[model samples]
Target: SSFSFGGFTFKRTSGSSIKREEEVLTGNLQTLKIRVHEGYEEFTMVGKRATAILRKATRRLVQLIVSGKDEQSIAEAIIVAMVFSQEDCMIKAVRGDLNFVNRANQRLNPMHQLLRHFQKDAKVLFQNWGIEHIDNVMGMVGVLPDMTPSTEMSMRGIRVSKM
Candidate 1:
């Protein structure tokens, strides 16, 4: 199930992809017993001492929309919820003096987490950081995108720090 916010309907899915609901003409809908999350979850308070957090976070997201004077994409809204409201968010953790690199979970590389963070919150973080764009922010994070061989011989020795 999904709910609407800022003129866009939102749903929480497992993968990193964004999708919209559409009617399948000439076919019956298939129903599954799987779980879901929607924008309404952000509205109601739940848990111990976390209601305050939700209010402030939701307010911030609304402010972002108001400041831009336009509706944000569904992807952006979802990113905002995760980065602002959730405690396990990779980017949000960094904002709150938490470390990004963790040795316990070696299954996924640190760079993978960084890449996902960049993908989700690049525009918003860049705006808050007051930078012109995301390139410098990526540089600050120190995780380079996949690229070709170095043109210059002097750049051959790039040392990477292991966490």
Candidate 2:
């Protein structure tokens, strides 16, 4: 276990004479899963189909964290969870004509502007962590077979929104 005090993270490693094999990092998704038969004691709440859709992906995120993947990777994994998953909601808002604006060509109000500011902030944070953007990461991994059309569509949205 470890915790950061000031800028340093410290861990306690007990001495063990027994030799343990060095694990290989093959960087494959299958390499991530390891479980023993145990009763579930620390279950967390999940909405309907949430587990089915996100558990595996989120598990990959946590696995990346434990496996010592860079911090940037961990952040992108979490970001994609919302951005890709919630694209349909965002697209509707982007159009604005159906609900908020009655005309086909209506100037969006401050809400859209506010979203851009937030997006820019997140982009800066990601770039600071050395990630180019979500597209590069997700593209390198390729598509998951189970991804819905909306999620797939989200992948096509302007890379990094690169504004």
Candidate 3:
């Protein structure tokens, strides 16, 4: 993922239109994989990093529960971990300086590499750039209820980027 420091909606442009989904279903962390239209490949950065983030957050949540701040801690931890999605990520060759579009024009896209930065820099980055509410990566999914019957269905997201 793409992220916003302001009112920006996150979008995922699939490499193929035939199939458009990659999941992280509570297991298979290091063996991160995504299934595209006609093939499947490894998404190492996402799978591995997400596993660590979730593990850390979950462990902290449980510890907090035993130590008395379980309710609030768990809630915050869940949201924090959920915010980490692996799409539209901007990669960089190194950490520190900002890697703009032109600068990132190397042979490798580096989007995956940029994720490594997030793993190491979540705290500082979050502290300096986090939005008060939905300002972070969003997880709003629309599902059709049993009471409703519809022939047409689609998944859409809204992101407004200011600067």
Candidate 4:
């Protein structure tokens, strides 16, 4: 069984530790899963996928800032970037058996403060939008598998399975 949330996928499996050992021996490196929560929302992602998402989100954040998008749009984008940063930090902390708070303080807090300094207006706009809006935006960001022409064969197989 598996589920997805916050643009990440989670598989429900027994013997996670043993599975992880198998993953190591096979050099798959794909079995390491980290679960994180933001308030009532929970998300789980493989370590490799988390790192890739972090890199992509960071690039998007930088691009949005350089493009000089509207304050509200940039602020919304920042929230997504911050979520990826926190998730990445969470994975790192779990792997190192380190304190997540301290890890976030060292890595995530600086970015928060830096953005607050220049984007205070955007910050205010984000706050004004409230938690409900934030959650809605997060829900909207959930990714779907690509269905482009290159994957036509794979998509056809999926359709056959559904039928």
- lDDT: worst 10-residue window of model 3: 59-68
Looking at model 1, the pairs that clash are none
Q: Write the per-residue lDDT of candidate 2 for residues 1-163, one digit (tens) a residue.
A: 3332212232323211222222112112112111211211111212221111122121121111111133333233333332322222322223222223456324533333324432434443222222212334332331221221122322222221110
> Top lDDT: which candidate number?
1
Q: How close is candidate 2 to the true structure, as a TM-score?
A: 0.19
TM-score for each prediction? 0.18, 0.19, 0.22, 0.20
- Expressed as tens digits, the lDDT of each residue in 15-50 for candidate 4 is 121111111110122233322222212222332223
TM-score of 4: 0.20
Q: For candidate 2, which ten residues in a row score worst on lDDT?
A: 59-68
Using TM-score as the measure, what is the rank order of every candidate, best first? 3, 4, 2, 1
Candidate 3 stretches greater than 4 Å from native: 1-95, 98-109, 133-163
Between 1 and 4, whose lDDT is larger? 1
lDDT, candidate 3, equals 0.25
Cα-based lDDT at residue 57, candidate 2: 26
User: Candidate 4 — which pairs collide?
Assistant: none
What's the CA error at residue 4 for candidate 3, in Å?
23
Note the residue pairs that clash in candidate 2. Answer: none
lDDT, candidates in the order shown: 0.27, 0.25, 0.25, 0.26
Tell me the deviation in Å of residue 122 in model 1: 5.5
- The residue ranges of model 1 lying beyond 4 angstroms of the native Cα positions read 1-41, 44-72, 92-163
